[PDB]
Each structure stands twice: as C-alpha cells, then as structure tokens.
Nucleic acid binder design. Structure first.
Ligand SMILES: [Ca+2]
Ligand SMILES: [Ca+2]
Ligand SMILES: [Ca+2]
Ligand SMILES: [Ca+2]
Ligand SMILES: [Ca+2]
Ligand SMILES: [Ca+2]
Ligand SMILES: [Ca+2]
Length: 112
RNA sequence: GAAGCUGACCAGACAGUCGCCGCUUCGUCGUCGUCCUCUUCGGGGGAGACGGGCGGAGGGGAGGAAAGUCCGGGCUCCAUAGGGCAGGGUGCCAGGUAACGCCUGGGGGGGAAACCCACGACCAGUGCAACAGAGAGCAAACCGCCGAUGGCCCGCGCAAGCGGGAUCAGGUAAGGGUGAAAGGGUGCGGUAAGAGCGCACCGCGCGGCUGGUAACAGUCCGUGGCACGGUAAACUCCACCCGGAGCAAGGCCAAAUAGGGGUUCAUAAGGUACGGCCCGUACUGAACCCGGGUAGGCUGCUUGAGCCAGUGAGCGAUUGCUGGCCUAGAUGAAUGACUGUCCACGACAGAACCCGGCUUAUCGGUCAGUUUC
RNA sequence: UCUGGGGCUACGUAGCUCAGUUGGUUAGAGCACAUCACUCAUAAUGAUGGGGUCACAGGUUCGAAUCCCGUCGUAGCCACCA
C-alpha cells in the first residue's frame, strides 16, 4: 500500500502557522527539515519553496515532484514524525543522484 | 562542388515498475408538491436524479512561447437627452464579427550588400556656452576696401593723374575662411578691386493634359534669381472612447449588537455618476475603528468565430456551403529511475476564464529565395 | 525566520531619505573607516577621501535620466449577512 490520497496533504494554513510557531530545526546548511511530533499516526508532508529563497522557477516544481515521490516511496518506512522539507539557495548545483543520496543519509540517521 | 535570415515547420516513445484527476454500468449511506403496485405506514418490483462516496472495465493531462492587461475585444449591483469639450490615440488608400501598434504599393533614397514610412499647417509669440554671437540678425574683409560717385594728409604754374593711412549705414560678409558639418553653378558689357541689377538650365505655391478608391508623378504653359530647402505628444484639427475597479460580482443550512461617536441642515464647499469646471435626475448623512463569524462547495467561457478538403476573385491575409473533430484545469498549488533499435543529448521556462502581435534564452533537421569560380 | 492566478507606484540619481517639462551643471547632504587648538576618545553651525558605466548597442547634429511592447528585487491593501 503506497498510495497518496488527498487527505495525506496539508490543506489549511492554520496547521502551517501552528508548526511554524514552534518548529524543530535539524538539518544541513543546504537542505533542512522542520516538523513536530504528530498524534494522529499517519505521517504528513508539506512544501514551502520561497521564490526569494529559490530562484529559477523551472525548479521547485521539479523539486516538489521529486520530494513528493521520495515521500510516497518511503512513506511507511519513516516513523509517525511529521516532516516539512526546505531547500536553501545552493541546491540546484547538486544533481539528482547527490540529492537522493543526501536524503538517504539524512533519513537513515533519524533512528529513535 | 561550401556558407547567413524569415515564411512556416519538430520536442513520439514503449515489455515491468510505483500508480495524482471529471464520465457510464452493478450495487454501498439519506430522498424527491410525476407514485403506479400496495399503502397494514419495516419498504420491496422504479420511468429521471446528488455528495471532499468504494470496489472493475476505456480514452487522456509540458514552447516558439501560458512570465510580462504591454495594445484592443468577449461578461455582472450603482448612474448615463451637451450647439460644453479641458487630455491621451489612425496622420500614405481599401479590407471580415464592435477591435486596434499584423499584412499589399506606386511618387521620395542605401527599388541588395539597410525590407525603413514614425512621408499630415512652419517667421499666424519674444528663449537654452560653441561666450567664433553661421545653425536666429550678424560682420575694427581678416599679407585684395582710398588700387576713385560722398571727406582729409605726403609730389603740382591751365588745380589733370598714382600708392597707403583696417574713419563713417565703406558693392561686402559665403564669390574667399579659423571651433558648425563650406546654408547652389564656371559664365553673356556683371569690370567700378562687382552686391542675382536683364539671363535658356534643375527645383516652389497657383491652376489644365496621362493616369487617381489616394498621397502625386513630365518645365508641356506663365509669372519671381526665389521670398526660410533645415529642429513636431514645440500653441493646433479629428469620421471611432469618453463605462470606473475586474471574475476572489449576485445564490445557500437548526448560529443574533441597525453597535457611545463627528465637523448641521426650509436654497449654498460631506460620497454630482458625466467635468480636482455650471446642470440635467435625487439616498433619510458625512476621512474610522473597539474583527460578530468564516475554509463545508459549485455552475459563471469549460460543445468557447480552433482546425482539414472542395467554389466566379487576387501584387493579399478570404470559408455563401458539405462532414465533423471538440474524451485536457481539483485552486500550497498535475510528470519518477532502470536491462534498448534511428539519435536531432532533456538549452530556458509552465499549463485555473479566451484571441490577434512583441528584431526575445531559442545549440539541433531545410522545402522558397544571396555572392563567389 | 509565514503565500502559486491578479493590480496604482516609489527605485540601478552612489545599497536608503529629499525627486529635474535634458535651467551643457566631473555638481549635494544624513550610514562600514579617516586628518586640524590631542571633544576628560556616545561624530557634524567648518575644509574633504567622491569605482552617483546615474541599467544593456540606441536623436545616423555630442550625450546619460522625462520619449521602451525586448529583465531582476523590496514596501502602502482585496472573498459576505446590513
Ligand atoms: Ca510539441
Ligand atoms: Ca493575453
Ligand atoms: Ca459587492
Ligand atoms: Ca492533446
Ligand atoms: Ca482555464
Ligand atoms: Ca473551476
Ligand atoms: Ca502565431
């Protein structure tokens, strides 16, 4: 079961505001993750790519698609922790292989 | 035998992955002032239907540009009888829904080494360092200006005739030159060191002849050596607007603040649409808070003048007609990697109201048209 | 350290604040750091250090900036019931 329903995506800015009021910061100077412990069990994801933070509008959409595919491909493996991914300016230089391996190393250490 | 640029033109992919989205059939939860079968009222046998509502079966969802209302049009509450007309737009003529800044060519040049029209009245007022007042008025001519119409001085017995003295409205300044791009031509008695003072020749306004739906094209006839050939949203003209802001603008379910409050009222400066300009026509008010609530939704253009072949007409873009095609749009926001045959390597960007254009980042494939030998 | 359809503007006049219907003008002032009677060392009643291509080739008389359909970024706000 590796589906991707609409209910598994954020649809209200209120939840965004709540998680941004008290975010948990842990990541790298190039890519980082914010989020908090969830109570409903089913993991959730969210995407915030600022035009100022990330220029080259041909990106983001590609980045959104790639990160959504990685999330749905590794939905069950990751714990109930909510996750939101934010990429800094220096991301486009790394290719897809580098991005995939960096995300793999990142998510292979969150062992609690 | 080898090379530019536009007219247009191409951005498919699959045997497995993993699977984001409207529709029809079978049922799954609650019903219908068309109700037959019954109505004994648990609803069974329905002709037509809904909801972020699940299980199957099918067709589909990225550029020559959607960023950029940059220009014009398609569609809502609230006004709308100018002989007012301030102010922004065709400025060569004709052309399709109401539409403009797309396209055709003659008179004017670089009608091939430039595809460019943005070619409308110019002393109908008195203005910007080049401090040479020539690009608005000026001239102690610049090794020619007494080498003579008007005065003086140096050489004179009928008071004849030469050189200079940069003195004056002394032919002058473009026939010569010094920073401004030489703002016409040798010439006939221009001879007075010569200022167009009468001059065949190219060119201006005015009118006839060949064409013109239209700007004009040939000194064929005249008058003038002529008198400004040169800087336009730099006073001005309209046959089409004068309607603001735009699609997040009307419509809804058993939820309760029309809530102290402000510049004073029987004509006058509170929000006169239409004039930061005078009216025609008249809401029981007048720069704000002290948020009472809100993400549960949908038609509005989603069968929209977009497309193909065949007709009297063209230097040029056309559809009166014949089949159709039309199976791409939920508002955190629609596309991933691999075992492969042409190989033109995936450069840069985005699909949620629509169309006609923009020398654009556009490497790659040439049908029409170039000079070279 | 918050937002993809959409808008009237302020800017490359040094990166901000004042803005010129080309007043032929290497020209102004208030932030990083500086010299003079040693402010009992929290800057301007005085002289100045002035990489102010005043965005890219653009008026074929000499020109940047009022005359750009060819590009970037920040700040003044918007769905109803009366
Ligand atoms: Ca294509
Ligand atoms: Ca458009
Ligand atoms: Ca309204
Ligand atoms: Ca298609
Ligand atoms: Ca649409
Ligand atoms: Ca819609
Ligand atoms: Ca086209």
């Amino acid at each position: 079961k590796l589906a991707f329903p609409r209910e598994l995506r954020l649809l209200t800015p209120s939840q965004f505001t709540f998680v941004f009021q008290q975010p948990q910061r842990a990541g790298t100077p190039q890519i980082t993750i914010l989020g908090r412990l969830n109570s409903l069990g089913h993991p959730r994801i969210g995407l915030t790519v600022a035009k100022k933070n990330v220029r080259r509008a041909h990106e983001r959409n590609r980045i959104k698609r790639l990160t959504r595919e990685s999330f749905r491909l590794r939905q069950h493996e990751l714990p109930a922790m909510d996750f939101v991914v934010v990429a800094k300016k220096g991301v486009a230089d790394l290719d897809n292989r580098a991005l995939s391996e960096a995300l793999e190393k990142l998510w292979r250490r969150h062992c609690r």
